[PDB]
């Protein structure tokens, strides 16, 4: 068993789609004006049970 046909656009697309990449579950943190990582340390104000590191 190995391909017997060239494979049309219809078959190929039905396969490769029905699922798609999505962005991570980042939250918008208005305390630094940029996205943070939900329930994880923020990349611009340190938010995760205290805020003190802006790196």
């Amino acid at each position: 068993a190995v391909p017997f046909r060239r494979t049309s656009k219809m078959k190929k697309r039905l396969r490769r789609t029905h699922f798609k990449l999505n962005v991570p579950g980042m939250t918008e943190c208005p305390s630094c004006g940029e996205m943070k990582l939900s329930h994880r340390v923020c990349k611009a104000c340190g938010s995760y049970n205290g805020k003190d590191i802006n790196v």
Binding site: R6, S8, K9, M10
Partner: protein
């Protein structure tokens, strides 16, 4: 004395792919498969011009036969009785007039029965 190539060949090719246009993205983007669709479409056409004309008979009669039944009469003796009443079939096709005016078909059905009494 050497042939042009290109353009000339693409003229001949275009006819096939135009007749096979509107299908898929594999039935006229591919020449060798487009060829096969043109054969089918042309053959289909010609046979069906005669097939359809006989099918119309096998369509009007079906409608008429039912309508006739709602006036106490069957198609076989309807058609006969019409010829007995004036020497007119009056076209089975044109007895489509049972849709347009119900009144006409009703009295013409009774007129059929008249010579069968």
């Amino acid at each position: 004395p050497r042939v042009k190539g290109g353009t000339v060949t693409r003229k001949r090719r275009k006819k096939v792919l135009k007749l096979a246009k509107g299908y898929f993205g594999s039935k006229h983007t591919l020449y060798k498969v487009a060829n096969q669709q043109v054969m089918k479409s042309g053959n289909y056409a010609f046979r069906d011009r005669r097939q359809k004309k006989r099918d119309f008979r096998k369509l009007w009669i079906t409608r008429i036969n039912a309508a006739a039944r709602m006036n106490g009469l069957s198609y076989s003796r309807l058609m006969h009785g019409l010829k007995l009443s004036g020497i007119e079939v009056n076209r089975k096709m044109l007895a489509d007039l049972a849709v347009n005016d119900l009144t006409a078909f009703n009295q013409l059905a009774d007129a059929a029965k008249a010579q069968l009494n």
